[PDB]
């Protein structure tokens, strides 16, 4: 399952390289990942920090402790990791993934598409999950075998039902554990039910599968049926090409 390995390699690189890390945390969404310029991005950060120190009447150092800086590895919250992973899979010279441009599906529409995926094609789904206050990506690589395994990638700020998890810790502990369409469907349906199944949440989302780390009282009850679902076909060789280019910073 070569796609998971590409995402792991990105997670590990972006944890030790400032150049790769500013790519992980980039927000110039119109620029495809392979074409981003880490030097300019880091300069943009320094310009913002310097301007903000002048705006707040304080030192650069004080602003950096609040906002971060271009000279420190920054760990992304969930929506940033989910955007960057979509870009790894999908970006190329004529496409640049951006959340605001993507077509969202209703749960009904998504359940149909998912129950009917061609076996020989790869798909990737970006989710914003209203009840969990969370974002994550689900990778459905092409498969020969009767039904499809999928792999969930994420990081999490940890202020909701789930706890804090770094993109790299997730990738190197639990991202390669396969989940079935059933497991996924169960989460999307179940999270809006009267009872939610905290065990199933721990299985999908917690890095130790540890239900005791969860906080059921942080569920955002009125949003449990609000999702943003963005589903794409992908070509594995495009992901591989983005990683080879990135591997030369």
């Amino acid at each position: 399952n070569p796609s998971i390995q590409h995402v792991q390699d990105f997670a590990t690189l972006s944890a030790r390289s400032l150049r790769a890390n500013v790519l992980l945390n980039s927000d110039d969404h119109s620029v495809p990942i392979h074409a981003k310029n880490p030097s300019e991005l880091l300069e943009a950060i320094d310009n913002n920090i310097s301007q903000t120190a002048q705006d707040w009447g304080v030192s650069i150092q004080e602003v950096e402790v609040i906002l971060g800086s271009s000279k420190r590895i920054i760990e992304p919250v969930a929506g940033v990791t989910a955007n960057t992973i979509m870009k790894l899979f999908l970006d190329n010279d004529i496409f640049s993934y951006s959340f605001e441009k993507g077509q969202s599906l209703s749960l009904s529409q998504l359940q149909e598409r998912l129950a009917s995926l061609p076996a020989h094609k790869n798909f990737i789904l970006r989710v914003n999950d209203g009840g969990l206050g969370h974002a994550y990506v689900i990778d459905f690589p092409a498969t020969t075998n009767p039904s499809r395994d999928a792999f969930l990638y994420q990081s999490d700020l940890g202020e909701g039902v789930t706890r804090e998890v770094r993109f790299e810790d997730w990738m190197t502990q639990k991202a390669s554990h396969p989940i079935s369409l059933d497991d996924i469907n169960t989460h999307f349906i179940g999270i809006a039910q009267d009872q939610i199944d905290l065990a199933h949440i721990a299985k999908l989302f917690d890095v130790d599968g540890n239900v005791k780390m969860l906080r059921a009282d942080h569920l955002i009850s009125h949003k449990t049926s609000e999702f943003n679902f963005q589903l794409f076909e992908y070509d594995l060789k495009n992901l591989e090409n983005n990683m080879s280019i990135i591997k030369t910073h």
Binding site: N25, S26, D27, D28, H29, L41, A44, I45, N47, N48, Q51, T52, D55, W56, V58, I66, L67, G68, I74, E75, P76, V77, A78, G79, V80, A82, N83, F99, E100, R126, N128, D129, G130, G133, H134, A135, S155, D156, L157, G158, E159, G160, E164, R166, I220, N228
Partner: protein, 74 residues
């Protein structure tokens, strides 16, 4: 009223709100633009974190105020 939410790279996201809007609504319109769930966003207003359930008025967010969007783990 128009405010600016600035990311770490200084990218400026314009946002239209009302004084009685909860800070949570500002986070919803940032989600529409950037894809970040509101509960994964941290908004800083001149050095201070804000309670999402308070309003723009409570925090004295006015026309032309600039907020900072922090998108890193604690």
């Amino acid at each position: 009223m128009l405010i600016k939410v600035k990311t770490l790279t200084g990218k400026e996201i314009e946002i239209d709100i009302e004084p009685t809007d909860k800070v949570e609504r500002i986070k919803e319109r940032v989600e529409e633009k950037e894809g970040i769930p509101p509960q994964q966003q941290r908004l800083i207003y001149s050095g201070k974190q804000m309670n999402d359930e308070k309003t723009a008025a409570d925090y004295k967010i006015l026309g032309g105020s600039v907020l900072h969007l922090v998108l890193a783990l604690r």
